[PDB]
Amino acid sequence: ANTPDRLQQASLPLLSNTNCKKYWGTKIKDAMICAGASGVSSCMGDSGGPLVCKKNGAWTLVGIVSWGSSTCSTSTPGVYARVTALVNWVQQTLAAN
């Protein structure tokens, strides 16, 4: 198992939750988004980091690295926390603190 000194990046496609269920079944909830199975994978030590997509010229946090393949299989999608489902909670937390 090889731990990089230097920050890594990978481009990867989003999946629909219905298509993600082919891989992970009923584990996939509304507050998750899958990405990958495209020849790249998030792996141990990436947890908590970002999945970003361009909106209107700016990088936007779409996912938070969460869970997936115990082997970081590049033919299985990673599972990320879906930020759209959680951002009302983020904004109320900031506004109250």
Binding site: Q9, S42, D46, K55, S66
Partner: protein, 131 residues
């Protein structure tokens, strides 16, 4: 990240390393402003952990990094440790980040935003490159 590539140094300026007090990296996070980091609930961050901002090479002793203390941890109460659903925690910094070329914030979406299936996005981190 397996089968990724090295980033351009400083090109993901919201990417932080969550380190315990002895220096080991255990999780990533994203700055959303000078005072707040978004990370995963399962990371179990405590106020004794350190937010490291502005890092590219974790083996370098010469980068301009910021070691930021944590005032309070706000784990989403709906986080479910059996299903891993609602996997989000906010860290409120006791020492604000100083934004720079290499340190700055990611945008948050609107709750209504549509990120369509098939869209090419990007993930970053210092996770294993081989299992």
């Amino acid at each position: 990240i397996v089968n990724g590539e090295e980033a351009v140094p400083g090109s993901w300026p919201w990417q932080v390393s969550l380190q315990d007090k002895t220096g080991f990296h255990f999780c990533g996070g994203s700055l959303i402003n000078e005072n707040w980091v978004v990370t995963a609930a399962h990371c179990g961050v405590t106020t004794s952990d350190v937010v490291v901002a502005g890092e590219f090479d974790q083996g370098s002793s010469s980068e301009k990094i910021q070691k930021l203390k944590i005032a309070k941890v706000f784990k989403n109460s709906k986080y479910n440790s059996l299903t891993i659903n609602n996997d989000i925690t906010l860290l409120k910094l006791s020492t604000a980040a100083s934004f720079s070329q290499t340190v700055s914030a990611v945008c948050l979406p609107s709750a209504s935003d549509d990120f369509a299936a098939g869209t090419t996005c990007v993930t970053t981190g210092w996770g294993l490159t081989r299992y």
